[PDB]
Amino acid sequence: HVSAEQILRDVYKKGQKDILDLEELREYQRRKRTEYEGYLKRNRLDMGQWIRYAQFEIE
RNA sequence: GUUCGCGAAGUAACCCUUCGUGGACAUUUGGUCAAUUUGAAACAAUACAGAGAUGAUCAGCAGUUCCCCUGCAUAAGGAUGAACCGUUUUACAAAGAGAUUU
Numbered sequence: 001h002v003s004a005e006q007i008l009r010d011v012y013k014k015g016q017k018d019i020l021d022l023e024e025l026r027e028y029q030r031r032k033r034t035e036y037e038g039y040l041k042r043n044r045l046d047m048g049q050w051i052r053y054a055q056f057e058i059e
Numbered sequence: 060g061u062u063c064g065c066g067a068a069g070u071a072a073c074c075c076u077u078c079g080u081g082g083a084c085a086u087u088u089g090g091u092c093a094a095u096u097u098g099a100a101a102c103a104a105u106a107c108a109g110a111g112a113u114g115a116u117c118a119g120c121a122g123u124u125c126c127c128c129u130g131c132a133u134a135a136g137g138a139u140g141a142a143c144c145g146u147u148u149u150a151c152a153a154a155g156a157g158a159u160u161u
C-alpha cells in the first residue's frame with residue numbers, strides 16, 4: 001500500500017546507499033594543512049575548526 | 060698653455076729671440092646599473108569538457124578571501140570574475156534503578 005511516509009522511507013533508503021615511509025607522511029601532512037588553512041583563511045571564525053586542526057597537529 | 064717679473068746668452072741698446080727661474084690663473088668625472096644559457100614576464104598548440112541558485116533555461120546585485128586581470132579610475136567589466144559546497148564528540152553534570160567488592 002502507498003502513502004507519503006512509505007515514499008520518503010524509500011527515498012531515505014535510496015540516498016543512504018597506508019603510510020609506509022616519511023615522504024608519504026609529509027604528503028599527507030601538506031595536503032591536510034592546505035585543507036585546514038584554506039577553511040580558516042576563508043572563515044576566520046568557527047573555533048571548532050581551530051580545535052580540530054590543533055588536534056590534527058597533536059596526532 | 061697665458062700673464063707678471065728676475066738673470067744669462069744673439070743682434071743689442073731698452074727691442075727681440077733661446078734658455079733657466081719665483082709668483083698668478085685653472086683643481087677630483089661615473090656606477091643602486093658588466094656583453095647569449097645558470098637569479099627568474101608570460102601566453103599560445105594537441106586532448107578533454109561546454110557556465111550558479113534547474114525538473115529546463117536564464118537576468119543579476121552583493122558578501123568573506125594571505126587570488127586577482129582589463130581599466131584614467133572611488134565608475135564599470137572579467138561565467139552573478141573565480142574560490143565558497145568539505146571535515147564535524149569532552150565548560151559533561153544531577154536524581155533514581157540492577158549486579159561486584161569492602
Ligand SMILES: [Mg+2]
Nearest residue numbers: 121139140141
Ligand atoms: Mg562575485
Ligand SMILES: [Mg+2]
Nearest residue numbers: 136137139140
Ligand atoms: Mg562584478
